[PDB]
């Protein structure tokens, strides 16, 4: 796997707040979430809310019947990453009590000035087999790929900030496994 188009973040000449007087545009920086998962079924999600009172918008799928306990752990908030452009990153994490048939990896690097560090290579390979030599098994003959790559925020000359995201490349080798019952 890798993030595609890391070099796009060298555009510091396109409606950027200058660092200082006569300087270049501030590069995309600050809070980032780099996550990817490979499973034989939908990634399974746990809802956790910074603020249980937040009104999430129509068109999105978010923890329902939120209570104050939703700000640490409310077991009602269970869901399947079954739809694109619907599950807000800030509401959901992989549910570590499930996801037996998926391997997920993620890093939150928070902070306002935190610099993006992005490595590209075609020489690195993650092994998806567990302690018992078994990788995700694809129910209904379907591979689930899941990802988030919020790189940080772009500051325009007004000072407003947007999340900037980038695409993720997946290459997955699968083999044929006999299974019973």
């Amino acid at each position: 796997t890798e993030v595609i188009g890391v070099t796009s973040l060298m555009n510091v000449h396109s409606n950027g707040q200058a660092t200082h007087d006569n300087g270049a545009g501030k590069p995309v920086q600050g809070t980032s979430f780099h996550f990817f998962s490979v499973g034989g079924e939908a990634l399974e999600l746990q809802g956790v809310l910074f603020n249980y009172r937040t009104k999430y918008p129509d068109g999105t799928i978010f923890p329902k019947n939120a209570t104050v306990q939703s700000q640490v752990m409310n077991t009602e908030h269970k869901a399947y990453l079954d739809k694109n452009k619907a599950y807000p990153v800030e509401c959901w994490v992989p549910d570590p009590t499930r996801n037996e048939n998926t391997r997920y990896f993620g890093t939150l690097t928070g902070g306002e000035n935190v610099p993006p560090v992005l490595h590209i290579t075609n020489t690195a390979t993650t092994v998806l087999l567990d302690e018992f030599g078994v990788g995700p098994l694809c129910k209904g003959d379907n591979l689930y790929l899941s990802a988030v790559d919020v790189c940080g925020m772009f500051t325009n000359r007004s000072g407003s900030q947007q999340w900037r995201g980038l695409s993720r490349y997946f290459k997955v080798q699968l083999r044929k496994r006999r299974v019973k019952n």
Partner: antibody
Amino acid sequence: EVQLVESGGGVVQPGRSLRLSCAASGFTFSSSAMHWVRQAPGKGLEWVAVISYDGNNQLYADSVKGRLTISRDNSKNALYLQLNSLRTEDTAVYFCARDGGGYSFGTYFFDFWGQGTLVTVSS
Amino acid sequence: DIQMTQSPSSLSASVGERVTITCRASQRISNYLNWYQQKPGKAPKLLIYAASTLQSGVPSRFSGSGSGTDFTLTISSLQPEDFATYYCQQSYSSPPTFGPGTKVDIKR
């Protein structure tokens, strides 16, 4: 020719409701974020509401949040403003304005205004 | 919010004179400053966006300057159709806010 015709203005009692419409022509309505700006009689210009190109995102001025609803229908080239829980202070001509292209950065200005529609809130 | 104040409250001038209205934002707003003309009973028209950028179709006698807190609209040779109110508006923060406006009177 770029064109914006508001309608639905009239007299309305405090507490009651009223729905302004705005018929857009002669530009890709579906690509422009759209706005309502009001002017109380002889007073200044006050920004009221913005809606995204989509119709799916709305932002409102503190002074009107919870009493007005901006909506659109890109099939009909129409922008609407729903006025609820009206107050005498809400009396104004309401202007329909095309966003200048800055919606996304939170930087609003108005490169085309309609001739307006008058809303009078009195007992 | 960002408060916008304006020039003089009203200005008396004559056809052919050089007119200069000022605008002032309560804080730094870079060049996110826009100018409209309103005549009585009519809708405002965009004259200037981003402080000095003329809207297409607007006469070249109209010019805008300023960056930061202090901005000026300039009519080189005023024409009779320029007798109007002039509003400045910051586009820098939400909510976008207008100044009180400047009425431009026929001096006699």
